[PDB]
Design a protein around this ligand. Structure first.
Ligand SMILES: Cc1cc2nc3c(=O)[nH]c(=O)nc-3n(C[C@H](O)[C@H](O)[C@H](O)COP(=O)(O)O)c2cc1C
Length: 169
């Protein structure tokens, strides 16, 4: 399959709204949305191209539904999969743990064989520390709907263009 499986979690709905934007931005290239509150870890097996969305909560912690699946990721093999990440977070209120959730998820998924695509520049954010940092870039798209909502659509448009190349669409 060349459809993209987008698996997101949300507590206050912001990550879901951004997920819908990414689906729209992919245009006629199909992206299928999956809320992880309704998923089983084995649903991840169904795609070769995955997009993982998660907000960071409670000072550096996973969104609740994602924590449930996280615990079972050693039950899946991500070899042969290309995986991109996005997150929502607040760089002003949580400057020391900005986007940690996607960094925790990517470290596990890459341990299990997934190959990360979609690295994103840190220019234009004001933060101190992040578990999503990888040699000076973020592991994936960092969105901030609390402080930088006006930038979200442009950031998504750019990242989707990069993803279509990295997924070979
Ligand atoms: C109590 C609380 C703690 C938060 N902790 C973090 C954090 O550690 N890191 C961060 O980047 N954002 C943090 N956020 C910001 C949320 O990730 C952000 O509002 C996000 O858009 C929520 O996504 P959701 O609506 O999909 O759940 C926190 C927000 C609140 C209210």
């Amino acid at each position: 399959s060349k459809k993209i499986g987008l698996f997101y979690g949300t507590q206050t709905g912001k990550t879901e709204s951004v997920a819908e934007i990414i689906r729209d931005e992919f245009g006629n290239d199909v992206v299928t949305l999956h809320d992880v509150s309704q998923a089983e870890v084995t649903d991840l097996n169904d795609y070769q191209y995955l997009i993982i969305g998660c907000p960071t909560w409670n000072i550096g912690e996973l969104q609740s539904d994602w924590e449930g699946l996280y615990s079972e990721l050693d039950d899946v093999d991500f070899n042969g999969k290309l995986v991109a990440y996005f997150g929502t977070g607040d760089q002003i209120g949580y400057a020391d743990n900005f986007q940690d959730a996607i960094g925790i998820l990517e470290e596990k998924i890459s341990q299990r064989g997934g190959k990360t695509v979609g690295y994103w520049s840190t220019d234009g954010y004001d933060f101190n520390d992040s578990k999503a940092l990888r040699n000076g870039k973020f592991v994936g798209l960092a969105l901030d709907e609390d402080n930088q909502s006006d930038l979200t659509d442009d950031r998504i448009k750019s990242w989707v263009a990069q993803l279509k190349s990295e997924f070979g669409l």
